[PDB]
């Protein structure tokens, strides 16, 4: 299996573009930035709203937790490669934390509102608008030979007041190389694509499109997460109970994959559940035929069948968003 688009991006670019291990970091001064207040926390880093004490400019300080040098050179390299792209967080500086010596990444500030509080207030148009902005970021990174691999609401910062969106946390992102087998333990469980759950390791940019679909499904149906599995095996079960097992069988046969005995049993046999069956009084204001058609073209077992970010942006669902830009 190989990407249907941007497959040769890294082939045509100099080795130094994608050879992140050769990266030698040029450090800045830690004392230039000061923690104002903590805003985020993860098992891979802590995030603080900060201030540049040289000019009173706001910024975000992401202090990484001790992890392999290679993993961090990869994130820095990808951030540097993508800097400037539409709606991608911009890395401004890299410093060593006062006490632990761990690299601290300095970013442009963003006045985010957790999605659990923000999403409930988004209107039909708001969702089209923000998803469109997110697609701009995905098509961009894919066009630059990079897979995000951890697309989810938690990694999408939105300043609702300014209607500004930024795709963050590239700590799991990787360079796409045709035929390369990647680790399936990427993304968050609820946003993992079928390929990661059945062990199809030669996946590509399309993985991000499935994750986007999960995120979108949660937004229009007000059901988050949309596929709520209790573990990786159950995650596939939850997906199969919606998309149906008939489609899963075709998919597995195409890629000559055979599920191990336990998972095959857990998955069982399920008829497909029409997207409209998810519409209720809580999400009716957001479920439209165009939204469903778009969602349907993202959530496909076969990664090769999914819309590419570029194709997704042209779907009629976003026609007003495009027209507003073109005027
Ligand atoms: N990792 C980041 C890179 C750039 C950013 N601008 C941000 C982040 C965050 O993690 C982040 C967060 O966890 C909570 C609130 C926020 O406002 C941000 C944020 O603004």
UniProtKB/Swiss-Prot annotation:
Catalytic reaction(s) noted: L-seryl-[protein] + ATP = O-phospho-L-seryl-[protein] + ADP + H(+); L-threonyl-[protein] + ATP = O-phospho-L-threonyl-[protein] + ADP + H(+)
Organism the protein comes from: Zea mays (Maize)
PANTHER family attached to this UniProt entry: CASEIN KINASE II SUBUNIT ALPHA
Gene Ontology CC annotations of this record: cytosol; nucleus; protein kinase CK2 complex
Family: Belongs to the protein kinase superfamily. Ser/Thr protein kinase family. CK2 subfamily.
UniProt keyword Transferase, yes or no: yes
Keywords for the protein's UniProt record, in alphabetical order: ATP-binding, Kinase, Nucleotide-binding, Serine/threonine-protein kinase, Transferase
GO biological process: DNA damage response; regulation of cell cycle
Protein's recorded name: Casein kinase II subunit alpha
EC number: 2.7.11.1
Binding, ATP: 39-47, 62
Alphabetical list of InterPro entries matching this protein: CK2_alpha, Kinase-like_dom_sf, Prot_kinase_dom, Protein_kinase_ATP_BS, Ser/Thr_kinase_AS
Domain of life: Eukaryota
Domain Protein kinase: 33-318
